[PDB]
Amino acid sequence: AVQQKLAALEKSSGGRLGVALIDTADNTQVLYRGDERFPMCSTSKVMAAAAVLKQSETQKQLLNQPVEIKPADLVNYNPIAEKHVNGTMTLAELSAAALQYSDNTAMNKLIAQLGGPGGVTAFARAIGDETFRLDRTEPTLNTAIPGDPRDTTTPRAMAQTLRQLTLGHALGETQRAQLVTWLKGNTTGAASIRAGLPTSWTAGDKTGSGDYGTTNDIAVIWPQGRAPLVLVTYFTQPQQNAESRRDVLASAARIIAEGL
Numbered sequence: 097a098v099q100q101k102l103a104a105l106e107k108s109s110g111g112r113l114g115v116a117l118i119d120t121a122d123n124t125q126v127l128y129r130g131d132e133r134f135p136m137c138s139t140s141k142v143m144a145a146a147a148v149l150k151q152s153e154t155q156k157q158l159l160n161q162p163v164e165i166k167p168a169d170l171v172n173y174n175p176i177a178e179k180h181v182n183g184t185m186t187l188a189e190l191s192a193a194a195l196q197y198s199d200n201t202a203m204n205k206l207i208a209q210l211g212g213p214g215g216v217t218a219f220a221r222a223i224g225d226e227t228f229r230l231d232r233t234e235p236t237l238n239t240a241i242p243g244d245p246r247d248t249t250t251p252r253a254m255a256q257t258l259r260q261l262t263l264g265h266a267l268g269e270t271q272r273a274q275l276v277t278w279l280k281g282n283t284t285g286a287a288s289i290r291a292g293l294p295t296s297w298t299a300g301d302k303t304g305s306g307d308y309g310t311t312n313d314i315a316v317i318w319p320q321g322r323a324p325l326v327l328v329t330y331f332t333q334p335q336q337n338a339e340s341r342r343d344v345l346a347s348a349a350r351i352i353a354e355g356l
């Protein structure tokens with residue numbers, strides 16, 4: 097049923113859809129193009145923030161460490177960082193800005209703290225994600241060119257990783273709770289996965305978008321009554337200037353929720 101429905105959604109959508117659900121009630125999965133690569137865009141911000149949280153397990157004051165924000169450090173979307181130019185933000189502030197407001201300058205500071213895009217990849221490998229790759233900084237990591245392997249992952253790999261980070265033991269308990277608190281306070285997500293879920297359900301999520309009408313969301317969800325779910329919805333289109341389609345992610349989420 098659900099496979100067919102997702103196929104029909106994709107057919108009407110004008111693009112390529114990738115879905116991965118993990119239902120922690122039974123550890124079962126529903127995949128659609130689950131092993132195909134998609135450009136992550138800002139959903140990669142979750143891995144960067146998590147990597148800094150992991151660092152903070154062995155440097156208890158790390159999240160209070162200041163990072164200089166210079167005018168030259170501002171990129172193309174800096175709703176929080178622009179307020180702090182010629183001053184400092186802590187790594188906590190940068191993680192919160194990157195996750196909850198999707199600030200690109202904040203993401204760049206996280207990447208630098210990790211040693212570059214490959215440092216984020218190295219963390220992914222250390223927590224068992226063999227698929228994730230971060231190759232570039234903001235804003236170029238959002239070019240989302242069809243067939244380009246840079247800055248991609250698969251829906252299956254991202255769902256497994258998001259589960260391990262938010263519900264499992266990839267991070268210490270304090271750090272896992274901090275990450276969940278941040279995702280639950282996201283400001284950008286009401287039109288995406290969460291728009292397709294019953295209103296009684298709660299969730300945390302991280303959105304992403306780029307060229308090729310690339311429109312993404314990854315979420316951890318607490319249904320009314322059921323064990324938590326982890327859900328990744330990735331969508332990308334053939335033309336570079338395609339419009340975003342958050343409604344397609346809401347539709348995919350709705351299909352998944354009605355199929356439980």
Ligand SMILES: CN(C)Cc1cccc(C(=O)Nc2cccc(-c3nnn[nH]3)c2)c1
Binds near residue numbers: 148153210222
């Ligand atoms: C070039 N590198 C600096 C990149 C980087 C950045 C942040 C975290 C890690 C990492 O793998 N951290 C990690 C991964 C798995 C376990 C532990 C650990 N064990 N005990 N305390 N921390 C730490 C890597």
Ligand SMILES: CN(C)Cc1cccc(C(=O)Nc2cccc(-c3nnn[nH]3)c2)c1
Binds near residue numbers: 138173199237303307
């Ligand atoms: C400048 N180009 C050469 C690369 C490029 C092309 C298209 C979009 C972006 C971008 O940064 N988009 C962007 C920037 C910040 C946040 C989000 C976002 N968060 N959640 N959904 N979209 C998306 C970059």
